[PDB]
Amino acid sequence: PTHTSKTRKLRGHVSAGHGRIGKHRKHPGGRGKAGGLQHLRSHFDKYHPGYFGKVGMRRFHLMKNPLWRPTVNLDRLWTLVPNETREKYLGKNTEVAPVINVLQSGYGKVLGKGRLPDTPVIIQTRYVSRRAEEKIKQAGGVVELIA
Amino acid sequence: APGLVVGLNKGKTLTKRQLPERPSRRKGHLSKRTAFVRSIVREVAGFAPYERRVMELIRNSQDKRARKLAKKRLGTLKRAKGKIEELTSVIQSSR
Amino acid sequence: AIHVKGQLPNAHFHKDWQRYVKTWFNQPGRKLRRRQARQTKAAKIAPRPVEAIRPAVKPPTIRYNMKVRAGRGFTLEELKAAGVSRRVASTIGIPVDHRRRNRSEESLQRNVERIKVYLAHLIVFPRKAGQPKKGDATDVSGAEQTDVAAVLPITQEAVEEAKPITEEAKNFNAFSTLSNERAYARYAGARAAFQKKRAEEAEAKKK
RNA sequence: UUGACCUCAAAUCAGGUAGGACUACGCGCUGAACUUAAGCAUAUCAAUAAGCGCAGGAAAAGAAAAUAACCAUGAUUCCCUCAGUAACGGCGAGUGAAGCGGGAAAAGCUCAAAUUUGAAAUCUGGCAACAUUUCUUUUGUUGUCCGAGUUGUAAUUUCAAGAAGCUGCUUUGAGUGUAGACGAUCGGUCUAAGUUCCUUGGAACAGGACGUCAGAGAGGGUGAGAACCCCGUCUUUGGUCGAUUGGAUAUGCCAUAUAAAGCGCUUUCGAAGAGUCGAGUUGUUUGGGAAUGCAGCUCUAAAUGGGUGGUAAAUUUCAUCUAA
RNA sequence: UGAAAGUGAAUGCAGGUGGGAACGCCCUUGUGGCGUGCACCAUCGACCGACCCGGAAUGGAAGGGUUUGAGU
RNA sequence: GUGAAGAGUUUCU
């Protein structure tokens, strides 16, 4: 609040912490971030490299909905099923395998990271990486593609 | 219909059904009464000067000149080709 | 000038922004006014439901096509399948959407099922009191205002918990199929051009 | 000569209408500069200030010539998010939307394009009569006559359709009086209680003692800090006007009520907005980038045609919509 | 990660080396040895994306690299 | 806009 501010302690000091020589005049190097190529170049080149220039193609009217594809890794596939489903199937030997719908969980692609249990499991996803599919096959499960 | 998110026929496979006919999409068809009215109007009013010039070019067998003139007068080449086809049909009917 | 750590400033306050500052001090008042307005409407239209029955539709785009939400109104084909005229649907509180069309039997059956449930649970007061006409009811004594959402909630599709792993699934190659299908779609036009050349440029070997 | 029609005049002709003011919000036109870019011209300030025209209680927008590319959505407006993102920018300073999704609220429709052609079935005005009133102030009906109108007023149709049939279909608008609830009610309230004693004080509304009310200890006044002195505060039924076919069986019932919609087999069909769309160029504007919108000039269309699908051009497909 | 089309992180105890907190076991008083070893730093590798390769219609699976990333 | 000439199916005077 105001009572704990530095201004209350600066009362009585003439320069208010801004010095007697340089003072606290209005904008002495310009306004905003102007001058980044001429007199702010030393700051720009050492703290914000790559600021000036053009790189890449333009895409007119980009819509992110067709590009929506969140990813999940293998070491979280068994976290998407309820606890009762995990107790029923994980580590057991059943005639049927649990089905994990990654799309319903809110992911577009299944990526291969971490390990999987040896219990078979069915993974439904729009996309899957090659390593993820190989590890799922090693674990005994299968990947069926959905839309 | 692969049923996947990639491919020529991608997408979830459902039970397709016949969509009902939309009367709005019937627009653009030529009616018998409208064609009769347009024929009468073409009988009463003559041809535009550019239409006559394109007709002369067609009768002189200068197809490229007729296409260029119709394109310049009517804007797009699609409209130019349609006008040339119509004028060619009228010339054939006249002959 | 800029000499401190952090990202470069990007404040969009070079106009007279203080003239058009919008405050929300009337937010509780607006909430109370809207609550009183809908309470007034409920008392005015009683015993009719406060909200009309809405169809269940699939949102567009791949980001939301896995969900189910409420639509604007039932289509003409859905009303015809449910045996409700479009001129009577508005009277009995069934919205009509002429723009939407049923491209799938699944959506058609889902919506006509919603209409049938609505019709079964609907009580229609006779226009002439004590003279029940065709389609009306004579048990209007117990009628009261009830929410349509409770009767017909918008239900998301259920997932399959488990199923046997088939040998066709075990032999299926998901990643290879995705790559091959993407390549097939990408180079479909090039193959079509090659087929056209293979036909036209080889027909020259006839004469 | 007269009459008819057309066009154009005049009347202090009969009846009307407009101006002006208010501008917080609203719809447009016109339109800067200071300033920032550490200078400065593009840019920015800003599609702002000033100027001008025009409304209401809201205005505007609005039921796709709309998105999307999906398992598809579905009038308009507003909020959150998209997003300080795509994009624009001496790519410098800076600027900067839209689809989807969630919510508030939801309401749909009307004409022109058709031969009623066995009947202009349409409308205004004068006169007269009969009703009506927030109201002797308001608003209609009927009769007759004269005008408008065939260079087109009525009816079924508006593309979601629909018409002509063929063809089985089924059946309804308007006065009064009682019990709860509704704008305002008010003859305005049963709406509760100390002004007892002692001290100080000019004055007790201060302190102390003895009490009281409280669904009322919010506030104000009274000669100083008053729940009980006063106005008030809290709770609380009933008189009256009006709506009282506002609603209930709105009774008792006036008399609506015999000609009018609906699904369905079937075909013939199915009229759909022009100096408009579109193209070029110029200016301006936009995030819109080989033109986002607007405007001037030139050219100037078509009927499965035309618009849109955010990179200019040609060709072939597809999706969506149906402008002027 | 790349401009993008796209691809997309375990050889191992989720690796080795050095210092290293705390703890445990001994020697005897030491600025003592032994065993693991949190955090952090330095370093040698492994994996993912990009690039440069060979590269045995479409695909780039294995083998690589003096490299490159705001990665595991 | 309307009518006559001229120039090596047309528009220049």
Curated annotation (Swiss-Prot), chain A:
Protein location: Cytoplasm; Nucleus; Nucleus, Nucleolus
Gene Ontology terms, MF aspect: structural constituent of ribosome
One Pfam entry name: Ribosomal_L27A
Entry keywords, A to Z: Cytoplasm, Nucleus, Phosphoprotein, Ribonucleoprotein, Ribosomal protein
One GO cellular component term: nucleus
Residues annotated with Phosphotyrosine modification: 107
Acetylation listed as a keyword: no
Region span, Disordered: 1-37
Chain intervals with Basic residues compositional bias: 1-12, 20-30
Function: Component of the ribosome, a large ribonucleoprotein complex responsible for the synthesis of proteins in the cell. The small ribosomal subunit (SSU) binds messenger RNAs (mRNAs) and translates the encoded message by selecting cognate aminoacyl-transfer RNA (tRNA) molecules. The large subunit (LSU) contains the ribosomal catalytic site termed the peptidyl transferase center (PTC), which catalyzes the formation of peptide bonds, thereby polymerizing the amino acids delivered by tRNAs into a polypeptide chain.
Misc: There are 2 genes for uL15 in S.pombe.
Subunit record text: Component of the large ribosomal subunit (LSU). Mature yeast ribosomes consist of a small (40S) and a large (60S) subunit. The 40S small subunit contains 1 molecule of ribosomal RNA (18S rRNA) and at least 33 different proteins. The large 60S subunit contains 3 rRNA molecules (25S, 5.8S and 5S rRNA) and at least 46 different proteins.
Protein name per UniProt: Large ribosomal subunit protein uL15B
From Swiss-Prot, chain B:
UniProt subunit comment: Component of the large ribosomal subunit (LSU). Mature yeast ribosomes consist of a small (40S) and a large (60S) subunit. The 40S small subunit contains 1 molecule of ribosomal RNA (18S rRNA) and at least 33 different proteins. The large 60S subunit contains 3 rRNA molecules (25S, 5.8S and 5S rRNA) and at least 46 different proteins.
GO molecular function terms attached to this record: structural constituent of ribosome
Record's function text: Component of the ribosome, a large ribonucleoprotein complex responsible for the synthesis of proteins in the cell. The small ribosomal subunit (SSU) binds messenger RNAs (mRNAs) and translates the encoded message by selecting cognate aminoacyl-transfer RNA (tRNA) molecules. The large subunit (LSU) contains the ribosomal catalytic site termed the peptidyl transferase center (PTC), which catalyzes the formation of peptide bonds, thereby polymerizing the amino acids delivered by tRNAs into a polypeptide chain.
Organism name: Schizosaccharomyces pombe (strain 972 / ATCC 24843)
Cited PROSITE patterns: RIBOSOMAL_L36E
UniProt keyword annotation of Ribonucleoprotein present: yes
Domain of life, source organism: Eukaryota
Protein name: Large ribosomal subunit protein eL36B
Localization terms from the record: Cytoplasm
PANTHER family referenced in this protein's UniProt entry, alphabetically: 60S RIBOSOMAL PROTEIN L36
Coiled coil: none
UniProt record similarity statement: Belongs to the eukaryotic ribosomal protein eL36 family.
Entry annotated with the keyword Cell membrane: no
Extra remark: There are 2 genes for eL36 in S.pombe.
GO cellular component, one term: cytosol
One of the GO biological process terms: cytoplasmic translation
Curated annotation (Swiss-Prot), chain C:
Pfam annotation, one family: Ribosomal_L13e
Coiled-coil annotated residue ranges, if any: none
One Gene Ontology CC term in the entry: cytosolic large ribosomal subunit
GO molecular function: RNA binding; structural constituent of ribosome
Keyword Ribonucleoprotein: yes
Gene Ontology biological-process entries: cytoplasmic translation
Highest taxon, organism lineage: Eukaryota
Location (main, coarse): cytoplasm
Record-listed Phosphoserine modification sites: 176, 179
InterPro entries documented for this protein: Ribosomal_eL13, Ribosomal_eL13_CS
Function in brief: Component of the ribosome, a large ribonucleoprotein complex responsible for the synthesis of proteins in the cell. The small ribosomal subunit (SSU) binds messenger RNAs (mRNAs) and translates the encoded message by selecting cognate aminoacyl-transfer RNA (tRNA) molecules. The large subunit (LSU) contains the ribosomal catalytic site termed the peptidyl transferase center (PTC), which catalyzes the formation of peptide bonds, thereby polymerizing the amino acids delivered by tRNAs into a polypeptide chain.
Family, similarity comment: Belongs to the eukaryotic ribosomal protein eL13 family.
Protein name: Large ribosomal subunit protein eL13
Organism: Schizosaccharomyces pombe (strain 972 / ATCC 24843) (Fission yeast)
